[PDB]
Amino acid sequence: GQKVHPNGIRLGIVKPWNSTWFANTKEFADNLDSDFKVRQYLTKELAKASVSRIVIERPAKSIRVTIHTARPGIVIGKKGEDVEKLRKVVADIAGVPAQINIAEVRKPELDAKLVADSITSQLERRVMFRRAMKRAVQNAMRLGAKGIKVEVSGRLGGAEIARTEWYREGRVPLHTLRADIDYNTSEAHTTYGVIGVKVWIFKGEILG
Template sequence: GIVIGKKGEDIEKLKADLVKKTGLPVNINIEEVKKPELDAKLVAESIAQQLEKRIQFRRAMKRAVGNAMRLGAQGIKVAVAGRLNGAEIARTEWYREGRVPLHTFRADID
């Protein structure tokens, strides 16, 4: 994986750095994300990386929405804000597909 590295090398390096900086023993638990396309934080980071690579923001948004819906999400809402495409005036654009009930307490929204 990304954090683990080959045979856990990166974990040990991270652990050694943290012990050196804090002077305290450190315990690291890593959980694998089975479907990263359904994790809100990972989707947001993916869109941000695509924007940094100068990919069109609408294409990045639609790709994220399509991937999430294809993998079984009931609904997804994505918003990007700022100087989109380098425009002088900042704006917010969002795209939604499926159900996103923000007013329902029992809805499992990530």
């Protein structure tokens, strides 16, 4: 289990946190649990909507969710009909006043998580994994990624002996802390088993 998590190593420097609140040792665990719940719910709901990052932020006994999604239109539905619906359920989950914001993700081919999800979907609907991977890589490159890597693993083409294959393009420096490396993962629950998809997308280096 060689490698360090690319997001996790960079949280202090170039990457920010998702859950962004303060709490004392008393209420912290509970808060975490709540976050887990709400996030889980959101994932369940907005599966068909291309959702990248849920950012929870709770000040003053009131939860502020921020959903980063590629297509707001399907998450919002009719203007303030679906969002509103989501909100009350979120509140219920939390046990506090809820507030949902929806950030529009520019360039969903450069968002790593989204790409991974897409790949997983493709796998599920029985495409050639390799061709999917290629598409993922190519598209990102076209869009202006300084580099991208993707990796898929296990029961590829329903084969008895599992293996991993991966496509890199451009440069993807992981040891370099100041590199904006959007990393994320997904899992294709195929007929032969799970197929895990990792993808690293290098936006560029930050100078500060």
